[PDB]
């Protein structure tokens, strides 16, 4: 059962940055970045393949968020460039077992996750 | 070896799915959320029925997934 461990977050203004990294037990074939608001869903932000480094992003996050990986040191980031209010969440990371796979449409949706992390906060103010 | 990464094969009435390496993939697999069984000759996704894999016995809908689990 992969051990996932996510850093980084933090209170910040809007237009700032902060970058959130994700330690993990193993890699399984996809490593995501999901985030939950309070009384919403968790949302998926962005998608890594391992083998190869291919990128997938929510539609809201595209040219603010970059996720990447070190393999070298089994972590996962995600660079959160130009911070807006709706960013304020709980970030968690995940992945899945060695038999899981993912297709394009479906590498943000939760449900093709088995492993999850705890979370780590992120606070977007206005002033 | 033709590149074809991360998704299904509609054939011949067979169903296949291919991971990050372009090769069909063998065996019980989750993909998507959804349970399967490729056959570890044919590649086949078991479809359509009831088989026995290491001594129990399971549904597929025709779309290869596992009922429930």
């Known amino acids: 059962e992969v051990q996932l461990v996510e850093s980084g977050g933090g209170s910040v203004q809007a237009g700032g940055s902060l ?3 994700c330690a993990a037990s193993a890699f399984g074939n996809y490593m995501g970045w999901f985030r939950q608001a309070p009384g919403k869903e968790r949302e998926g932000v962005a998608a890594i393949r391992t083998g190869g480094g291919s990128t997938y992003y929510t539609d809201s996050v595209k040219g603010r968020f970059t996720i990447s990986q070190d393999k ?3 972590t ?3 660079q959160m460039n130009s911070l807006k209010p709706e960013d304020t969440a709980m970030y968690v990371c995940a992945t899945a077992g060695d038999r899981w ?7 943000l949706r939760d449900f093709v996750y088995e492993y999850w992390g705890q979370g780590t906060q992120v606070t977007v103010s206005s002033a | 070896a033709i590149r074809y990464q991360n998704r299904f094969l509609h054939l011949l009435g067979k ?3 291919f991971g990050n390496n372009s090769k069909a993939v063998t065996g019980w697999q989750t993909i998507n959320g ?7 000759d044919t590649a086949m996704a078991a479809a ?3 088989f026995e894999i290491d001594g129990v016995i ?4 025709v779309d290869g997934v596992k009922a429930m689990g």
Request: net charge positive.
């Open chain 1, 19 to 21: 970058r959130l990294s």
């Open chain 2, 15 to 17: 169903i296949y799915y």
């Open chain 2, 34 to 40: 959804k349970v399967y069984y490729f056959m570890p």
């Open chain 2, 48 to 50: 359509g029925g009831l």
């Open chain 1, 76 to 78: 996962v980031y995600l």
């Open chain 1, 101 to 107: 796979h993912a297709t394009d449409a479906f590498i």
């Open chain 1, 72 to 74: 070298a040191k089994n």
């Open chain 2, 58 to 61: 399971y549904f597929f809908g």
